[PDB]
Amino acid sequence: PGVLDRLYGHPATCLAVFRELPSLAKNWVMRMLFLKKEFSKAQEESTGLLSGLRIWHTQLLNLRIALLGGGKAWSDDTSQLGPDKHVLHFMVGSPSAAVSQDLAQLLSQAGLMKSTEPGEPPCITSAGFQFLLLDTPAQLWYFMLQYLQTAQSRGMDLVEILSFLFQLSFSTLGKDYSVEGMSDSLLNFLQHLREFGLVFQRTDQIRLWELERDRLRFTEGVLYNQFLSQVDFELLLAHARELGVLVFENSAKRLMVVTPAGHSDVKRFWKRQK
Amino acid sequence: MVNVLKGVLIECDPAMKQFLLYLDESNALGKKFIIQDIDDTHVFVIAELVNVLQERVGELMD
Amino acid sequence: ERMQILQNFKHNPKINTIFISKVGDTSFDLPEANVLIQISSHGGSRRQEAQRLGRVLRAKKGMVAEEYNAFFYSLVSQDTQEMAYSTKRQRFLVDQGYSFKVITKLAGMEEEDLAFSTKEEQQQLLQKVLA
User: Fold this and answer.
1) What φ, ψ does residue A188 adopt, rounded to 5°?
2) If you count DSSP H runs as helices and E runs as strands, how many of each does chain C have, helices first?
3) Gap between the Cα atoms of B41 and A13, Å rounded
4) Which contacts (CB < 8 Å, 24+ apart) does range C84-87 have?
5) CA C106, C111, C116, C120 torsion: positive or negative?
6) Residue C55, annotated as binding a ligand
7) Where would I find the beta strands (DSSP E) of C60-121?
8) What do the Gene Ontology cellular component annotations say (chain B)?
9) In chain A, helix, strand, coil percent, each to 5?
């Protein structure tokens, strides 16, 4: 048993060392998970701590019963930690951790209902800007939060949960864009919402790739330049289009050249200064 | 040499189709407006608004 | 002269390509080969292409039980009335049980000597054809 602290300690060390910048922690945290853990963990640096926090509840899945209750005891501490901490990476970590605590069923529905974290998931869910990666953890959190409630008889949270309704505008967007990944996440929210509270609530194709190619055909939107006063001003204005990579054509014997519309303005500015 | 600028569309067609567009330009009704000039055999300065028409007409035509 | 060319084509290992006009169809003993190229989509019948293919082509030795051991080609100019015949041709041959594909590029045609290497050469043919 004297060995136990030492071995696991070395991995605690490794995680500590490359704790700050990237996402090294995930694999190592898992190993750490098996072997007042939460109380002691709290002192350690946040990232990675959260990673360990995330995976440990997952890992639980007799003495096990004891473990769950023990975890339930300091669910608050992690919750206090979760907020306050609140990049995309961090954001992913906070909801992933929250989601994980939720499936454990340790979290108190009350308390959760009135908390910043629930506002934050729908906030990111609402905004178009968030990336697909943030979206999936946000979505998962919501799903898990609703999953946590297997009652709704006594669950204030299943009120705030209603915040999903706000999402429809977001789904309209997303749909407008070809973001299939952003739509699927929405559907999961809907389906899960219905699930919890459902009781309460009332060759041939060769011509088709050719027909696709008929919808693509080229030309470019473009400025032409002519009647240039002397050769040095063609060559300067031409070299300064070529380094901008927006020369479509050039002919030095014409003293004539062509720029596509996206670098009309960098040329209009260079023509004014020098 | 930044004497003159002209927004136009530069068409980079092949040495086969280009003359077809030219033909489109002439012998046509409400046309001849289409091509500003032939900068190269491959490229032409053309249209703007006409580009939709030129492409479509080429499509419809053989 | 036909029976000399056709005896040469069948027995002589030096005489391996010949060119033939519509006279092969309707009572004619076209010889055996393993490759058929049609320079154009024509107006004789999609069904006569399959009769002509079927009566001319056979397996090359050794490979007599493989997925293919003989070859048929039909050449089409893009952006012409020659293209219209394809959706019919394609449907016809696959309904006749044939494996059929479309080849749309040859970037190894850019690696060797072939005709019409210049615009001036192409112009020389263009003036002759127009006349």
Assistant:
1) -65, -40
2) 4, 2
3) 70
4) C85/C41, C85/C42, C85/C46, C86/C41, C87/A207
5) positive
6) yes
7) 71-74
8) cytoplasm; nucleolus; nucleoplasm; transcription factor TFIID complex; transcription factor TFIIH core complex; transcription factor TFIIH holo complex
9) 65, 5, 30
**B43-46, strands of its sheet edge to edge:** A249-251, A256-260, A220-226, B4-12, B43-46, B35-37
Other CB atoms within 10 Å distance of the CB of residue A149:
20
The pair of three-digit structure tokens given for residue C108, joined into one six-digit string: 């190894």
Structure solved via: cryo-EM
Contact yes or no for A206 and C94 at CB 8 A: no
State the amino acid at position C42 in one-letter form: H
C47 is in an annotated binding site: no
Please tell me the CATH code under which domain B4-62 is placed. 3.30.70.1220
The length of chain A is 274
Residue boundaries of the structural domains of chain B: 4-62
Tell me the residue ranges of DSSP E strands in chain A. Answer: 220-226, 249-251, 256-260
Which pairs from A228-232 meet CB under 8 Å and 24+ separation?
Answer: A228/A255, A228/A256, A228/B1, A228/B2, A228/B3, A229/B1, A229/B3, A230/B1, A231/A255, A231/B1, A232/B1
- What distance separates the 2 farthest-apart alpha carbons in chain A? 91
- CB–CB contact B40 A249 (8 Å): yes
**C-alpha distances out from residue C82 to A204, A215, C34, C42, C85, Å:** 19, 21, 25, 8, 7
Q: How far apart are CA C78 and CA A32, in angstroms?
A: 65
Locate C62 and state its tokens: 């050794």
Which helix H or strand E contains A92, and what residues bound it?
helix A88-104
Please, are residues A133 and A179 in contact by the beta-carbon 8 Å criterion? no
Kindly state whether A34 is in contact with chain B, defined as any CB-CB distance less than 8 angstroms. Answer: no
Closest CB from A222, A251, A271 relative to B10: A222
Distance CA A88, CA A135 (A): 10
Distance CA C69, CA C64 (A): 7
- B13 φ/ψ sector (left φ>0, alpha ψ -120 to 50, else beta): beta
Token pair belonging to A48: 């990675």
Whether A254 and B36 have beta carbons less than 8 Å apart is answered as no
Supply angle C-alpha A172, A175, A181, rounded to 5.
120
